[PDB]
Amino acid sequence: QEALENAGRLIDRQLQEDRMYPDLSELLMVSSGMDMDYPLQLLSVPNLPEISSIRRVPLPPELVEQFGHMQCNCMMGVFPPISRAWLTIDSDIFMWNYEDGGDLAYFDGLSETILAVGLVKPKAGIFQPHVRHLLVLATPVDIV
Amino acid sequence: PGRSSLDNIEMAYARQIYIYNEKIVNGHLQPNLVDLCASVAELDDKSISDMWTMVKQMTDVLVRMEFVRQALAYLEQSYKNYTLVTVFGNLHQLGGVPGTYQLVRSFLNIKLPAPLPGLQDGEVEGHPVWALIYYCMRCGDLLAASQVVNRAQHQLGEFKTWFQEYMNSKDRRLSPATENKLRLHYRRALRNNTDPYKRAVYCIIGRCDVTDNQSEVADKTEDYLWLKLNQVCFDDDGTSSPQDRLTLSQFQKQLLEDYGESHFTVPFLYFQVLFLTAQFEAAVAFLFRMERLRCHAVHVALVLFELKLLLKCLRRLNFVRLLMLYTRKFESTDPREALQYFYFLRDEKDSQGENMFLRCVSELVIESREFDMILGKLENDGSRKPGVIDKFTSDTKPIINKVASVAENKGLFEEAAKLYDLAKNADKVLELMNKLLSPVVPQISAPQSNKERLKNMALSIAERYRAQGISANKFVDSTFYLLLDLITFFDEYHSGHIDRAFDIIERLKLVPLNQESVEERVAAFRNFSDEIRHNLSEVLLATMNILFTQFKRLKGIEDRDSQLRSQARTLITFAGMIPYRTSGDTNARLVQME
Amino acid sequence: LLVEIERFFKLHQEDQACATCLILACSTCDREVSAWATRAFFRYGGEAQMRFTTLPVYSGKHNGICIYFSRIMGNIWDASLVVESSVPCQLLESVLQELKGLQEFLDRNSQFAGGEAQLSEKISLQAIQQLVRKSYQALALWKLLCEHQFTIIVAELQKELQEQLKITTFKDLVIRDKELTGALIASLINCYIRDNAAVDGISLHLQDIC
Amino acid sequence: GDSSLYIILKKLLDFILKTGGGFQRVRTHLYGSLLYYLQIAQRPDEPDTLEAAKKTMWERLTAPEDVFSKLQRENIAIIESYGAALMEVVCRDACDGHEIGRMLALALLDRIVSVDKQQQWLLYLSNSGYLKVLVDSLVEDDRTLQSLLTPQPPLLKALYTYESKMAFLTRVAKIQQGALELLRSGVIVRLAQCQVYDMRPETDMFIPTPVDRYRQILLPALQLCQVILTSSMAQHLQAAGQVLQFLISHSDTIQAILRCQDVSAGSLQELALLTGIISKAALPGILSEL
């Protein structure tokens, strides 16, 4: 009867309903065939388009310049947590700020070609458990 | 007739408010009243004009702002001015120095106290002393009047005492002591007898006999007012329990009874009495009568308004409404001017009035529908080009939404598009826009000059928005471009250029030019947006037309007639598949054959 | 869809359309056209098309508003208020600001909503509006507390009642536990912690709703 | 737009000038239609509106509106032609017949009056006719206020007309050329003859009503005198001298008027103002009485 309790009850009920919402994937959903709203054309789905392209950022030329000479190997990628991008040419590695681009970091530590790089979480209990992330870099000889 | 007379007048007045609004905006010191006084000089206005001078004296004539004190001052100064002028012109030049006393002696002596001198004054050494004291008093020169009495050679000398303290104080000479004594003497000795001026001085200074009027020497209507004003006692009137109190209210009522406008004759002068008396409301109402010149009443009100009066449309006094109703005359024709007048409403600073102003403007925009003028216009990037109101500023977005929605009710498309542009609802604009262009596309032919309308409107927006940081949905824009492409196809369809039309239509990628892919055109058909789905009818038949005319069987080498033939075939299969989902004109057939 | 919102209606449903419509109306940096249109949809629906109404259940408007309210608060609603406050100051300000916008919105267009299916709608809306204001009040107090020296008093103050206090959820404040807060607030004022204008506000608060 | 109305306005002027219509009854209808048309064209607007329009014309900075002024000009041209002819007809008519149709024709004359103030008319009208007749009719106005009681009834007729006559007189006085014509007609003389002023109203129906009525006549006549005075050059000019004589000769009324109350007071108040304006406007009646 009291409005205040009443309102609370309504929200709670609705909240419950929101939580109950059906599971995303079920075999039954598209057992016959998938419903698709599929246009070949960009912005073909006018109102509905799930994604839009907000912006394009080119690799900074300053960064590119230190990638100019690469005999052996190239590779690049984005680190999801960092919101930074990395470029590997031969031995050297660059990390550049997604948002900035001017800001870039360079590894001079590695002597040899860099086979692979990866971002990983630290162990539960080591001296560096505190650090947010670890950067693993593998070259032919060593893993740093 | 035509009466350029008023319109010219309307414009002159409008001009003045306009300058006034500029000053308020620019923090200037433009006087409203001087401005009218300047114009008013010309004639009939010789009343209205005096009224303005009265108000102007009031300029910053607060200085505190005591009703009777200011009225008194105006009357007193006016008399003084009158006196100075008379002196300032020949004679002697008066023999002596220009002192105020002598100026008045001159008025009394030279002016009409004597045709060739004489009668019932008390005179010593050729001078009516009492008349002098009275007039000096009239002028507002109380101190001098007092001095004259001091020097007087008289024998009512107790009165002399009562003059000096009347003067010493705020002029409401209230001794807890003698005032009573003075009154008794007046009744017994003075009241039944004496020299008119002497009586005046006693009565006026003393407030001796509240039944009011001075026998012989009330010679002017203003003399009449001044006397009455002198008599009222505002302060500490309530205190003291005699009923010898005379109030402004009482004075005001007498002026009403019958005395009437007729009674205050010079009806001309009545106006002034109302202002002096503090009947502002009545004053506007009275100005409200002849030709009241609704215009004059409005502006006067504006002037009282600047003065900060109005402290709580023939007979409708509220300032907002007085202004609003005035606007009714011109608003359709001169919406700009209306805005200028509505803006004055704010002059009464405070909420309520502010909202009244806002509502009035809102009301003006609505139903006048002068959106461009009032609200603004065309971006060319560079936001809005400000409308008149915007120059004034603020709540303008909410009004736009309100107007725009209304436009939607009425279905006044164009207005809606215009309104939404100002709203800066870019997506909404294009969508309404697509609808407008979309219909008018389907129909029957013979139109589309190359210069103005919905198509032209279409071109404006696309060029305009799309380049710049386009906020619209991709989908929305896409249909937009398609509609434009179809339109360019129209321009070139007819006006010759058969070959060009096919090329463009094919580019649309709507109609199967290739193989029997006509059916894929079916699959992609239902998917089509509502706007295009509607347009297809003409796309077909445009194709079978150009296709027909271009493929007019030629005269007498490579002639591939086969294509532009296969195209018709695929198109017909297409048309064959969707005739039901089309208006119902497979009279493609007529054009198809020959 | 602002110009045609049936499509949204069809897929999403009426209630959701109403909720989104409410958000657009309130939403800041929006064109007047958009806000007005969304307001119009929220208030009147589509003319001679989709009607906005209680049927012998509650209208979409109610559900839409409630859904909006529930969703904003959903994270905090169950969580315990005090641990220091569970939520940071920035967050408190955010919630307070948002609810404030809603509070003003409903306050302004309360006449339409309030004032039997129709009556039931009236009651429900009245209840929700009261709820929004109430949340505003609780958040307002917290905004106050964030300013300073809250922690010290809390430690010293808490007694036997303390167990009850610590397991108090935000919703508990939303649908208030009046006596404890009153005592605490009194301490905030009695002690030096509240500074200047804040203090005046609580005294006002105790007077008004205490 | 009352353009369609314009044509009727023309027809009306045509018929009047022709003065066909045995019935004044017919002409009363013509007068009524003309009256509305003249009134309708200028919805109540006052000098402010005209000034605003002129500024806008200011000059055609962009696209101006000068619609109402243009309409007034067309009306006035039409009217002019037809005008001389018709003025003759309208005034003569006046008198008689129709004390009735009178209410209608005097009102028509007054509206017309503003517009076409200025100009045109002053010259034409002047001459003739009117002035002579109207001044004589002032004298007779006094007599007519007494006859006023009787005729309260025939009052209805005449209030529509007598008031209209005073208004017509006041309007002519407002402008320089008009005031001159009235004064030439010997206004002060007729007023002396009417003896409206040279008496005391109180001296002598419920008495407050008669005081209101008498004072009412006094306020309009007094306004007419003040307007004629100021409207010339009130100073050294001859007009100043004439007005002063007016005040002195009718002194003590001016003084008596200064104090008391009622609706009667309201009329009294207006009369008092009117005298004050007369006073200052002239050589200060006080100034003269040095």
Short mmCIF file of N, CA, C and O in Angstrom, two decimals, chain B residues 459-494:
data_model
loop_
_atom_site.label_atom_id
_atom_site.label_comp_id
_atom_site.label_asym_id
_atom_site.label_seq_id
_atom_site.Cartn_x
_atom_site.Cartn_y
_atom_site.Cartn_z
N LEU B 459 19.49 18.16 -52.14
CA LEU B 459 20.84 18.42 -52.51
C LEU B 459 21.50 19.23 -51.44
O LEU B 459 22.66 19.01 -51.11
N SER B 460 20.76 20.20 -50.86
CA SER B 460 21.30 21.13 -49.90
C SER B 460 21.84 20.38 -48.72
O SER B 460 23.00 20.54 -48.35
N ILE B 461 21.00 19.52 -48.13
CA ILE B 461 21.34 18.81 -46.93
C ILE B 461 22.53 17.91 -47.14
O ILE B 461 23.45 17.90 -46.33
N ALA B 462 22.58 17.13 -48.25
CA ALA B 462 23.61 16.15 -48.42
C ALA B 462 24.95 16.80 -48.47
O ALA B 462 25.88 16.42 -47.76
N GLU B 463 25.07 17.85 -49.31
CA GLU B 463 26.31 18.51 -49.55
C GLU B 463 26.77 19.02 -48.24
O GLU B 463 27.93 18.91 -47.82
N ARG B 464 25.78 19.59 -47.56
CA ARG B 464 25.90 20.32 -46.36
C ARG B 464 26.36 19.52 -45.16
O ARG B 464 27.33 19.91 -44.50
N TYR B 465 25.63 18.44 -44.80
CA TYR B 465 25.91 17.64 -43.63
C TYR B 465 26.98 16.61 -43.82
O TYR B 465 27.89 16.47 -43.01
N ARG B 466 26.90 15.88 -44.95
CA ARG B 466 27.65 14.68 -45.15
C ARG B 466 29.12 14.90 -45.05
O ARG B 466 29.83 14.09 -44.47
N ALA B 467 29.63 16.00 -45.63
CA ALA B 467 31.03 16.24 -45.58
C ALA B 467 31.46 16.42 -44.15
O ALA B 467 32.53 15.96 -43.75
N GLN B 468 30.62 17.09 -43.34
CA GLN B 468 31.02 17.54 -42.03
C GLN B 468 30.63 16.64 -40.88
O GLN B 468 29.50 16.71 -40.39
N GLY B 469 31.57 15.78 -40.42
CA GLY B 469 31.48 15.06 -39.17
C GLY B 469 30.15 14.40 -38.99
O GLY B 469 29.73 14.12 -37.86
N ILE B 470 29.48 14.10 -40.11
CA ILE B 470 28.18 13.51 -40.25
C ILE B 470 27.80 12.61 -39.10
O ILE B 470 28.41 11.57 -38.85
N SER B 471 26.75 13.03 -38.36
CA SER B 471 26.16 12.39 -37.21
C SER B 471 25.08 11.43 -37.60
O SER B 471 24.55 10.73 -36.74
N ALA B 472 24.68 11.39 -38.88
CA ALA B 472 23.56 10.58 -39.27
C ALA B 472 23.95 9.13 -39.37
O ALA B 472 25.13 8.79 -39.39
N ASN B 473 22.93 8.25 -39.40
CA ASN B 473 23.14 6.84 -39.54
C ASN B 473 23.56 6.60 -40.96
O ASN B 473 23.17 7.33 -41.86
N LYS B 474 24.39 5.55 -41.16
CA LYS B 474 24.88 5.22 -42.47
C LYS B 474 23.72 4.83 -43.33
O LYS B 474 23.63 5.22 -44.49
N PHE B 475 22.78 4.06 -42.75
CA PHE B 475 21.63 3.57 -43.46
C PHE B 475 20.86 4.73 -43.97
O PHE B 475 20.46 4.77 -45.13
N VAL B 476 20.65 5.73 -43.10
CA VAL B 476 19.83 6.86 -43.42
C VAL B 476 20.47 7.59 -44.57
O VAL B 476 19.79 7.99 -45.51
N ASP B 477 21.81 7.76 -44.53
CA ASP B 477 22.50 8.47 -45.58
C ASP B 477 22.42 7.71 -46.86
O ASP B 477 22.30 8.29 -47.93
N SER B 478 22.49 6.37 -46.78
CA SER B 478 22.53 5.56 -47.97
C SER B 478 21.28 5.75 -48.75
O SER B 478 21.32 5.95 -49.97
N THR B 479 20.10 5.72 -48.08
CA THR B 479 18.88 5.84 -48.81
C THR B 479 18.87 7.19 -49.44
O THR B 479 18.37 7.38 -50.55
N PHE B 480 19.44 8.18 -48.73
CA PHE B 480 19.47 9.55 -49.16
C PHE B 480 20.18 9.63 -50.48
O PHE B 480 19.67 10.24 -51.42
N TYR B 481 21.37 9.01 -50.59
CA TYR B 481 22.12 9.08 -51.81
C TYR B 481 21.36 8.41 -52.91
O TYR B 481 21.34 8.91 -54.03
N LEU B 482 20.70 7.27 -52.62
CA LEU B 482 19.99 6.57 -53.63
C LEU B 482 18.93 7.45 -54.20
O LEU B 482 18.74 7.51 -55.41
N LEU B 483 18.21 8.19 -53.33
CA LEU B 483 17.14 9.02 -53.79
C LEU B 483 17.71 10.08 -54.68
O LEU B 483 17.10 10.43 -55.69
N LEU B 484 18.89 10.63 -54.34
CA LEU B 484 19.50 11.64 -55.16
C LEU B 484 19.89 11.06 -56.49
O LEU B 484 19.75 11.70 -57.52
N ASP B 485 20.42 9.82 -56.51
CA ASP B 485 20.86 9.25 -57.76
C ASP B 485 19.68 9.09 -58.67
O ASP B 485 19.76 9.34 -59.87
N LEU B 486 18.54 8.67 -58.11
CA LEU B 486 17.38 8.39 -58.88
C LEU B 486 16.94 9.68 -59.50
O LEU B 486 16.48 9.71 -60.64
N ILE B 487 17.07 10.80 -58.75
CA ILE B 487 16.64 12.11 -59.17
C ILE B 487 17.48 12.59 -60.32
O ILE B 487 16.96 13.16 -61.28
N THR B 488 18.81 12.36 -60.28
CA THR B 488 19.66 12.80 -61.35
C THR B 488 19.29 12.05 -62.59
O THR B 488 19.37 12.57 -63.70
N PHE B 489 18.86 10.78 -62.41
CA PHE B 489 18.42 9.94 -63.49
C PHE B 489 17.23 10.61 -64.12
O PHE B 489 17.10 10.60 -65.34
N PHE B 490 16.34 11.19 -63.29
CA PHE B 490 15.18 11.87 -63.79
C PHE B 490 15.57 13.05 -64.61
O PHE B 490 15.00 13.26 -65.68
N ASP B 491 16.55 13.85 -64.14
CA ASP B 491 16.89 15.06 -64.82
C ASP B 491 17.25 14.70 -66.23
O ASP B 491 16.73 15.28 -67.18
N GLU B 492 18.15 13.72 -66.37
CA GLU B 492 18.59 13.27 -67.65
C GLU B 492 17.58 12.42 -68.38
O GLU B 492 17.71 12.23 -69.58
N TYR B 493 16.59 11.83 -67.68
CA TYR B 493 15.58 11.10 -68.40
C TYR B 493 14.63 12.12 -68.97
O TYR B 493 13.98 12.87 -68.25
N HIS B 494 14.54 12.12 -70.32
CA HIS B 494 13.88 13.13 -71.10
C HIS B 494 14.91 14.20 -71.13
O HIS B 494 15.86 14.13 -70.35
#
